[PDB]
């Protein structure tokens, strides 16, 4: 019953990106695909809008001639596409589907935005992506342990990462990954893990950086 | 252009209590107002469409109110899981405009950070860097303060920090303060520190680890 969207891609200034929206379950009654973005820590700003049932289009002019929204009746999917990209477009974008109009009015319908998809971040930079080196955040100590994962020097975000593939959550916190110096991202994951667990349970921290597709598998033991 | 300020921007109300979020339109969108909360990282969720008339699956803590040029989402009694921003929108005429949000943090009881120190990885010093690690995990208020001592002189300027989103269980943070050196600079120094001071923990706390 939930939206999907294409992976996190990066451009270069002047390029053009194209996201979709593949339906998982089928189709379902909707009258409308919109995009909304959400730059790095902002709020959400509505860039355009399909409404079949009338056959017309809105947008913002932030975007005027520059976005094509596309909305296949079949596949109950939508490709979109930004053309002419500034670093200032550099956000999330998000699939959204309304399933009832509130309001028609100039050739347009108007609501709800009852579903919405998971988030694709797209970069716009002239810099070069570099995928990330992971090392360990080792333990040592008698009661809860902390061991942990160290992300530098990547380029694009964003980075993925989980334990034991996916089967360790709780007591798992990720860092925001923070801008370095260098111009290359850094983060940290850590993860709360009683003393005596050390020695026989295996600790692996996985992290994807699909802008570059290199996923790295590292295993954190303490240290001799 | 219609502009709608989302007032007040930053809250924090105690568990059970009531949070109230008010939205005000510049030129009357009357009743064509949506309610979206955004839970970290996650998507946003409907809650509110129309003025006031809840979204399908929503409990009914959240209620909204108002018409015009005025607006109002209160939610009572709340959970550990209703921190989040919460974003206003208006659909009365095209461009489709949001307000900038309403962070809501969820107080709790006082707690200590739990502190660790983490010695750079003999893999990442064969490049030519080094990072230290120092993680305050699972504690609360968010303001704290993390030192760096080294050689035991206090370091500035070669650190940076980040801090997760409120936990939606504990309502917990959790901090990372990370110290940068050059492979030499980190092998002439012997002793490294982190200093932690917090409104939780009656005195300063501080890790540290001599090199080998």
């Known amino acids: 019953v939930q939206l999907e969207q294409s992976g996190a891609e990066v451009k270069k200034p002047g390029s053009s990106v194209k996201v979709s929206c593949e339906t998982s379950?089928?189709?379902?009654?909707?009258?409308?695909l919109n995009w909304v973005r959400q730059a790095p820590g902002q709020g959400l700003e509505w860039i355009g809008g399909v409404v079949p049932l009338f056959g017309t289009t809105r947008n913002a002019q932030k975007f005027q001639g520059r976005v094509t929204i596309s909305d296949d009746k079949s596949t109950g999917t939508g490709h979109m596409e930004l053309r002419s990209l500034r670093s200032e477009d550099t956000a999330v974008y998000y699939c959204?589907?309304?399933?009832?109009?509130?309001?028609?009015?100039?050739?347009?319908?108007?609501?709800?935005?009852?579903?919405w998809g998971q988030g694709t971040l797209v970069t716009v930079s002239s810099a070069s992506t570099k995928g990330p080196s992971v090392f360990p955040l080792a333990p040592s100590s008698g009661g809860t342990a902390a061991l942990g994962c160290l992300v530098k020097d990547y380029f694009p975000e964003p980075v993925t990462v989980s334990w034991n593939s996916g089967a360790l959550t709780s007591g798992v916190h990720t860092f925001p990954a923070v801008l370095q110096s260098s111009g290359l991202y850094s983060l940290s994951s850590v993860v709360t893990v009683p003393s005596s667990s050390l020695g026989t349970q295996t600790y692996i921290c996985n992290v994807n950086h699909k802008p570059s597709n290199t996923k790295v598998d590292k295993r954190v033991e303490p240290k001799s | 252009e219609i502009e709608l300020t989302q007032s007040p921007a930053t809250l924090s109300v105690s568990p059970g209590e009531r949070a109230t979020l008010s939205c005000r339109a510049s030129?009357?969108?009357?009743?064509?107002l949506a309610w979206y909360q955004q839970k970290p990282g996650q998507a946003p969720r409907l809650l509110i469409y129309?003025?006031?008339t809840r979204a399908t699956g929503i409990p009914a803590r959240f209620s909204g109110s108002g018409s015009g040029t005025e607006f109002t989402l209160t939610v009572s009694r709340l959970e550990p899981e209703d921190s989040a921003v919460y974003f206003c929108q208006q659909y009365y005429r095209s461009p489709l405009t949001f307000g900038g949000g309403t962070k809501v943090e969820i107080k709790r009881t006082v707690a200590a950070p739990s502190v660790f120190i983490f010695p750079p990885s003999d893999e990442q010093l064969k490049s030519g860097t080094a990072s230290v690690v120092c993680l305050l995990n699972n504690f609360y208020p968010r303001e704290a303060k993390v030192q760096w001592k080294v050689d035991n002189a206090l370091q500035s300027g070669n650190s940076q920090e980040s801090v997760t989103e409120q936990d939606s269980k504990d309502s917990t943070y959790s901090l990372s303060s990370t110290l940068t050196l050059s492979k030499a600079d980190y092998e002439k120094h012997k002793v490294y520190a982190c200093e932690v001071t917090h409104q939780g923990l009656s005195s300063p706390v501080t890790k540290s680890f001599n090199r080998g």
């Open positions: 959204v589907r309304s399933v009832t109009p509130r309001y028609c009015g100039g050739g347009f319908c108007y609501g709800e935005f009852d579903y």
């Open positions: 379950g089928g189709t379902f009654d909707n009258y409308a």
């Open positions: 129309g003025a006031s």
């Open positions: 030129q009357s969108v009357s009743s064509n």
